[PDB]
């Protein structure tokens, strides 16, 4: 009894048609990933930084070690091509299967086969489908391990000499590190799982999650929900969808912070500098310039009485001054050579800054992730000229929006699934209004 | 009375706007008003 605008709710109990819808929808996702990569490649110019070019897919591929060499220089675009083509081709197959099951295929599965057919209230069947996909997901995570250890490695922004592609031979297995991250605070200087800053920990966590997902898939194939879970949840398709909505929302919020703060699995070489990074780089830039003119940056008092170039953090570390004091938790490969045990080392600042570090600071400062909707780069008072919005702003903003609506989608479908399950989603029964049988409040 | 199906009139009005509006966005990057 749904209206056209709620028309896909007509599929709830048509498993063969609902299968075609998912598989056709999976084809669109594969299609876009293929089309968009090729579109990016056709536009790519290798002499420009990726992040002056509106690229978000090519950086995800470079980061896996394909096509790049030392310092993120693109050496070979053919891998990019291959990824686009293969996705694009594969979408026709998913497309084919989706429209077949959606139009011609059996409308319902449970008569054609007892294996593929399902009933949402069959808690056992449901947890078996769950277990199958968990095993898939665990295999997925191990592919990333396989790449990193056996098939060429991964791009490492922290490698010596500019960063470079590196095979990971000692992935971190120590659970105290791996789950250590999951118990770090999400606040500044800690940053929960977003602070992961080396490929050993990245690959080791994927070994773990791969094992955990396979273990859990086998667990869920072999078992049925215990009574306490039986009585805690709503067991319906719309309830299950609302659970996944909640989870995707949470993941979207996390990915937003990952791309905004993390410069390890989003190398700044490809994505542009982070906000903190660019801000730190501005202080570095003027520290350098002023010191070449003879300024003693260690002993320069700023207008506030705090140091103009260098000051202390609240726990004592020597950090960049000005408003960037907020960003002193920033860590990046162009800066760390200057850190000593107490923070920035004044003797290395006076003696050991290298031209490449001058270059990289000047470059990141002039590529801060600020820009207008119409891609005028920089603060909102800048004149037109520079056509630039960071990949990072594009990826962070889009995913905050998506993550938000999915939380709204979670609330919508969770509340409805509860009400439908108890039988009052279509409204209040006039002849049995619960408030009219309750005593008055006063 | 009903000789033209309404959905077709709707589809073709539809692209009619998409074209005029897309021209107007193209024009934001060409010529007057493009900053160039």
């Amino acid at each position: 009894g749904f209206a056209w605008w709620a028309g896909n709710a007509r599929l709830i109990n048509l498993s063969g048609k609902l299968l075609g819808a998912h598989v056709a929808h999976a084809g669109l996702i594969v299609f876009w990933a293929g089309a968009m990569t090729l579109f990016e490649l056709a536009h790519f110019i290798p002499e420009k930084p990726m992040y002056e070019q509106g690229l978000i897919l090519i950086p995800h591929i470079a980061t896996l070690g394909w096509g790049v060499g030392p310092g993120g220089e693109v050496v070979d675009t053919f891998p990019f091509f291959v990824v686009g083509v293969v996705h694009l081709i594969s979408s026709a197959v998913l497309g084919f299967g989706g429209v077949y099951h959606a139009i011609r295929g059996p409308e319902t599965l449970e008569e054609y086969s007892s294996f593929f057919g399902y009933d949402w209230k069959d808690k056992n069947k449901m947890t078996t489908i769950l277990g199958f996909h968990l095993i898939v997901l665990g295999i997925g995570a191990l592919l990333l391990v396989a790449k990193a250890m056996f098939f060429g490695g991964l791009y490492d922004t922290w490698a010596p000499g500019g960063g470079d592609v590196r095979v990971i031979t000692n992935p971190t297995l120590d659970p105290r590190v791996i789950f250590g991250y999951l118990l770090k605070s999400p606040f500044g200087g800690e940053g929960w799982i977003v602070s992961v800053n080396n490929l050993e920990d990245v690959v080791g966590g994927h070994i773990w999650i791969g094992l955990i997902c396979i273990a859990g898939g086998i667990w869920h194939i072999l078992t049925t929900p215990f009574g306490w879970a039986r009585r805690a949840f709503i067991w319906s398709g719309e309830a299950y969808l609302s659970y996944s909505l909640g989870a995707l929302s949470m993941m979207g919020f996390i990915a937003t912070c990952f791309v905004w703060f993390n410069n390890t699995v989003y190398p700044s070489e490809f994505y542009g500098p982070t906000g903190p990074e660019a801000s730190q780089a501005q202080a570095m830039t003027f520290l350098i310039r002023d010191q070449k003119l003879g300024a003693n940056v260690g002993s320069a008092q700023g207008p506030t009485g705090l140091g103009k170039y260098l000051m202390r953090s609240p726990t004592g570390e020597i950090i960049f001054g000005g408003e960037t004091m907020r960003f002193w938790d920033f860590r990046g490969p162009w800066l760390e050579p200057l850190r000593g045990p107490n923070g920035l080392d004044l003797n290395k600042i006076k003696n050991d800054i290298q031209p490449w570090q001058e270059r990289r600071a000047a470059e990141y400062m002039t590529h801060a992730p600020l820009g207008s909707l119409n891609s005028v780069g920089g603060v909102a008072t800048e004149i037109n000229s520079v056509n630039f919005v960071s990949p990072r702003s594009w990826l962070a903003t889009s995913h905050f929006v998506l993550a938000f609506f999915f939380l709204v989608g979670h609330l919508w479908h969770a509340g409805r699934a509860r009400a439908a399950a108890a039988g009052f989603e279509k409204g209040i029964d006039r002849e049995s209004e619960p408030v009219l049988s309750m005593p008055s409040l006063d | 009375g009903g000789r033209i199906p309404l959905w077709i009139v709707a589809t073709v009005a539809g692209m009619g706007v998409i074209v005029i509006v897309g021209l107007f966005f193209y024009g934001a990057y060409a010529g007057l008003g493009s900053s160039l």
Partner: protein
């Protein structure tokens, strides 16, 4: 049996006719170079 020309008829064309004229004017404008 309906009438063609009505008050409604006039209200509509009093808006629709200048609209298309302005749209053509505004379309031409996109090809003006400085």
């Amino acid at each position: 049996s309906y009438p063609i020309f009505t008050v409604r008829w006039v209200a509509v064309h009093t808006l629709a006719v200048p609209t298309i004229f302005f749209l053509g004017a505004i379309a031409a404008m996109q090809f003006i170079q400085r």
